[PDB]
Amino acid sequence: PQDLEFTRLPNGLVIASLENYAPASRIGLFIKAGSRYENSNNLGTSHLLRLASSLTTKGASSFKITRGIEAVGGKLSVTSTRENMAYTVECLRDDVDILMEFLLNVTTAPEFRRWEVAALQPQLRIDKAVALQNPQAHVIENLHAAAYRNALANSLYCPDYRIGKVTPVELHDYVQNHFTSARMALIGLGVSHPVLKQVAEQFLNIRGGLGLSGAKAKYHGGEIREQNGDSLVHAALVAESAAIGSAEANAFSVLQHVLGAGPHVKRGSNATSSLYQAVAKGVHQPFDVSAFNASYSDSGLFGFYTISQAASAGDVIKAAYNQVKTIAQGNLSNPDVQAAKNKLKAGYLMSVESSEGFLDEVGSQALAAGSYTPPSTVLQQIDAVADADVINAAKKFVSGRKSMAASGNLGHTPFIDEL
Amino acid sequence: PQDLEFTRLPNGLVIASLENYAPASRIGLFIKAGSRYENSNNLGTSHLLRLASSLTTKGASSFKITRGIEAVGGKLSVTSTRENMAYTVECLRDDVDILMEFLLNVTTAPEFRRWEVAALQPQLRIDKAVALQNPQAHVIENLHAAAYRNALANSLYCPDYRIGKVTPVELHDYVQNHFTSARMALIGLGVSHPVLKQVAEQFLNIRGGLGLSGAKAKYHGGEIREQNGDSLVHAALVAESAAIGSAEANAFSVLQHVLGAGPHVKRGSNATSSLYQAVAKGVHQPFDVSAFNASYSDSGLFGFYTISQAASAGDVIKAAYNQVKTIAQGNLSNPDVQAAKNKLKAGYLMSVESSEGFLDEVGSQALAAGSYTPPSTVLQQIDAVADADVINAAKKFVSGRKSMAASGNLGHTPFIDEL
Amino acid sequence: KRSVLCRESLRGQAAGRPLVASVSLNVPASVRY
Amino acid sequence: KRSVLCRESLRGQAAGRPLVASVSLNVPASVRY
Numbered sequence: 001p002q003d004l005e006f007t008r009l010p011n012g013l014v015i016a017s018l019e020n021y022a023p024a025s026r027i028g029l030f031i032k033a034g035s036r037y038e039n040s041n042n043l044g045t046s047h048l049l050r051l052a053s054s055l056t057t058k059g060a061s062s063f064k065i066t067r068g069i070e071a072v073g074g075k076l077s078v079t080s081t082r083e084n085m086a087y088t089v090e091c092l093r094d095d096v097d098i099l100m101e102f103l104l105n106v107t108t109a110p111e112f113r114r115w116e117v118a119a120l121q122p123q124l125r126i127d128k129a130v131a132l133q134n135p136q137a138h139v140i141e142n143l144h145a146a147a148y149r150n151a152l153a154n155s156l157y158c159p160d161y162r163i164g165k166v167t168p169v170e171l172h173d174y175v176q177n178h179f180t181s182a183r184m185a186l187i188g189l190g191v192s193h194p195v196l197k198q199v200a201e202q203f204l205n206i207r208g209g210l211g212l213s214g215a216k217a218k219y220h221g222g223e224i225r226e227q228n229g230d231s232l233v234h235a236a237l238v239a240e241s242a243a244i245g246s247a248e249a250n251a252f253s254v255l256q257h258v259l260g261a262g263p264h265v266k267r268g269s270n271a272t273s274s275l276y277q278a279v280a281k282g283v284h285q286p287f288d289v290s291a292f293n294a295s296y297s298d299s300g301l302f303g304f305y306t307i308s309q310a311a312s313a314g315d316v317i318k319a320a321y322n323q324v325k326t327i328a329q330g331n332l333s334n335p336d337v338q339a340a341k342n343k344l345k346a347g348y349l350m351s352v353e354s355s356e357g358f359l360d361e362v363g364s365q366a367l368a369a370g371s372y373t374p375p376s377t378v379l380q381q382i383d384a385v386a387d388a389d390v391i392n393a394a395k396k397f398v399s400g401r402k403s404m405a406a407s408g409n410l411g412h413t414p415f416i417d418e419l
Numbered sequence: 420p421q422d423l424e425f426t427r428l429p430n431g432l433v434i435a436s437l438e439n440y441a442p443a444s445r446i447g448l449f450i451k452a453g454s455r456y457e458n459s460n461n462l463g464t465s466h467l468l469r470l471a472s473s474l475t476t477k478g479a480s481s482f483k484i485t486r487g488i489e490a491v492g493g494k495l496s497v498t499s500t501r502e503n504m505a506y507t508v509e510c511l512r513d514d515v516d517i518l519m520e521f522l523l524n525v526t527t528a529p530e531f532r533r534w535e536v537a538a539l540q541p542q543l544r545i546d547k548a549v550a551l552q553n554p555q556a557h558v559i560e561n562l563h564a565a566a567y568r569n570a571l572a573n574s575l576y577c578p579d580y581r582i583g584k585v586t587p588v589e590l591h592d593y594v595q596n597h598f599t600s601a602r603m604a605l606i607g608l609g610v611s612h613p614v615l616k617q618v619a620e621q622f623l624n625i626r627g628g629l630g631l632s633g634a635k636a637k638y639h640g641g642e643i644r645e646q647n648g649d650s651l652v653h654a655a656l657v658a659e660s661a662a663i664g665s666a667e668a669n670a671f672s673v674l675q676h677v678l679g680a681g682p683h684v685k686r687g688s689n690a691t692s693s694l695y696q697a698v699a700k701g702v703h704q705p706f707d708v709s710a711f712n713a714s715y716s717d718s719g720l721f722g723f724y725t726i727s728q729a730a731s732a733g734d735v736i737k738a739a740y741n742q743v744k745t746i747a748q749g750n751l752s753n754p755d756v757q758a759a760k761n762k763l764k765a766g767y768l769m770s771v772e773s774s775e776g777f778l779d780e781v782g783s784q785a786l787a788a789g790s791y792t793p794p795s796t797v798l799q800q801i802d803a804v805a806d807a808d809v810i811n812a813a814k815k816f817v818s819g820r821k822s823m824a825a826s827g828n829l830g831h832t833p834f835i836d837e838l
Numbered sequence: 839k840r841s842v843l844c845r846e847s848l849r850g851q852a853a854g855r856p857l858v859a860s861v862s863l864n865v866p867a868s869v870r871y
Numbered sequence: 872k873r874s875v876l877c878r879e880s881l882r883g884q885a886a887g888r889p890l891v892a893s894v895s896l897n898v899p900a901s902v903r904y
Binding site (some may be wrong): 055080 | 839842843844845846847848849850851852853854855856857858859860861862863864865866867869871
Binding site (some may be wrong): 470640681686726 | 885904
């Protein structure tokens with residue numbers, strides 16, 4: 001009924017709210033601290049911070065905090081990416097107040113006790129371990145660290161050698177410098193904005209400029225290669241995409257989809273996916289491949305991902321490239337761009353068809369722009385992309401510094417010079 | 420009294436001998452299997468092979484082998500490099516025969532038993548761990564896998580993921596293909612050649628061509644960077660050296676020494692080392708640096724090695740480069756080349772002033788050339804290097820594809836584009 | 839570990855705003871794109 | 872682990888024939904250049 005309601009304060013923190021109909025409300029304070037905010041000496045402290053969200057803080061002991069949310073059947077999720085760190089908080093309409101006072105403690109009153117922070121430490125390994133089970137995670141990670149040099153090439157997961165060495169002052173300093181007013185965006189899905197503000201005003205007023213971590217962007221072509229014993233091999237090939245919320249970017253997104261192979265059908269094969277077709281024809285029976293597309297504030301990464309077998313690695317890899325070369329040679333007919341488009345549009349909508357989805361989308365936008373762009377407008381922007389534009393962007397991959405990351409038996413994985 | 424005595428047989432295995440005066444005799448069968456002979460599927464096999472020297476074999480049980488050499492106070496060393504694998508065997512004049520029959524079983528009659536090979540396995544980790552304690556080894560290893568693509572890029576220590584996966588048919592295969600007649604060279608430091616030959620003839624006649632592992636060379640510039648928590652940082656910068664036993668090579672070696680900083684004085688600083696001087700002047704108080712020089716059959720690696728602290732990494736790294744650029748700009752006075760030369764010459768002679776040294780030198784030569792070049796001759800060759808020649812070589816590092824490896828806090832370590 | 843032998847493979851990463859988003863929650867836990 | 876604080880550092884690798892030669896012997900054991 002009532003649409004969202006943004007409001008930038010004097011501090012510069014953003015806040016939104018949507019009194020929805022249904023029974024479930026969810027706050028989420030998104031602080032601007034991603035993994036790109038750590039240095040050589042600070043690496044792995046966001047990771048630990050992410051995992052220390054239930055520790056004692058100034059008003060609420062670790063015990064109260066967890067038993068408290070249990071009391072009421074809430075959930076407290078602490079999500080992070082290379083650029084941001086969403087602190088989610090779900091619970092029943094009637095219990096938001098009990099819950100909010102928890103989110104506030106957790107975020108503005110953390111008390112990292114030597115003893116408490118010390119117990120955690122080992123959790124990092126356990127966490128890292130489970131996430132590194134998906135080749136995607138280590139390759140994807142390795143990708144970022146090869147393509148960047150300084151900031152976005154920092155991974156999400158603590159470096160093995162740092163684990164036990166993440167000190168209390170480190171956590172306290174990261175909170176202090178990054179968990180600040182200018183970088184924050186409140187976001188409610190079932191709360192009163194009037195009452196939200198009040199609270200935001202009372203609890204979120206802290207000073208801290210950007211880049212006390214060492215903010216800045218830079219792309220650097222590089223290749224990280226991980227040999228294994230596994231039959232299958234994964235590899236990424238990516239060159240500087242266009243930036244976040246910019247036209248070029250958007251273009252990329254649309255091109256992405258022309259090749260992009262995320263199956264829309266269970267047990268179904270893509271007929272739409274060029275990459276898949278092309279790859280497929282020159283490739284063996286079992287394989288899988290998809291267009292990769294990343295966009296961040298101050299740079300992007302666009303290019304594709306492959307999953308071949310030991311002796312097909314190259315064939316696949318090249319095949320994919322060649323095909324994306326085709327579009328950059330100009331060869332791309334109108335029919336396919338419009339399908340792509342509609343694919344993308346559909347996607348975005350579904351993406352925001354959920355509370356959790358919406359709440360992410362909103363916060364996300366808060367941190368980038370400073371307001372909420374409605375869907376419609378969104379939709380218009382994507383449509384504006386020119387059928388040529390797409391090609392043009394694609395031209396850029398082929399004529400853009402390469403950066404690749406592979407895993408598995410790498411006898412048959414092309415190097416930079418190979419392609 | 421009697422000088423060595425080489426002899427190539429119909430098989431193509433070389434054999435030498437020097438009845439010396441002194442009490443201690445040392446045989447050593449050098450088989451031509453280095454690390455470079457394994458594939459993606461066979462990596463780590465020489466390593467295990469190297470560690471499995473005391474296992475049961477066809478004529479002597481692991482127990483007899485060990486207890487036997489102990490009986491007499493003998494030593495059995497099994498040394499390898501990227502190109503070769505020297506199987507040394509020391510003992511008392513009188514006991515060569517008991518010992519030789521041991522060397523022959525170990526090498527021609529290995530019996531890798533599922534159970535025995537299996538209990539070894541864990542030793543690989545223990546061995547890898549103890550050699551990875553010197554930054555030099557992991558960097559120097561990282562260097563070779565960055566700079567090569569395929570063959571010499573293989574490391575001497577088994578890859579963590581392979582350890583327990585080293586199977587008995589692997590060991591059996593590796594021996595069979597590589598531990599053959601054409602690739603072998605017996606070498607005695609206190610044995611009769613007449614009696615040596617007989618034995619050689621009776622026990623070393625096995626067939627096996629080269630490259631059933633996949634022989635071939637290739638250089639590829641690349642950078643491997645390993646972040647740490649250690650104050651100090653080590654990095655290596657190296658371009659395709661000249662090949663083994665060729666003029667270019669030799670030139671490199673002389674050049675190496677003009678910059679080469681291997682202290683000749685305890686607690687003493689080099690006055691001679693240009694690198695050190697130049698680095699020193701632009702560098703801080705504590706630091707250390709030296710000229711790196713590697714030469715193999717089908718390729719080489721020349722350049723330097725640095726050890727700086729966090730913030731000084733670049734300054735030192737460039738400093739060192741700049742200085743080697745100087746020599747490449749032409750700036751190098753006669754007085755320094757002759758010093759160099761004499762330095763080299765003195766070193767090679769001291770290298771061979773010991774039994775162990777001599778024995779290595781000799782076998783080494785037998786796998787390359789096919790005969791023993793005497794010292795004198797050696798000495799002549801190094802002298803033939805032109806003062807220009809050196810410059811010219813140097814010109815080649817500055818104008819040859821770069822390839823670097825570093826470890827530690829890499830905030831301040833130049834990349835490829837940095838220098 | 840889950841065997842990845844057939845045609846079924848369909849994993850590769852690329853979302854709208856979020857990219858490689860790792861969650862750690864008090865209750866659940868995961869890795870998306 | 873041995874502390875490497877002072878001027879003493881003098882480790883860098885480069886020999887004549889042998890380069891990075893790793894020994895494994897029945898009795899002793901090591902890593903040279």
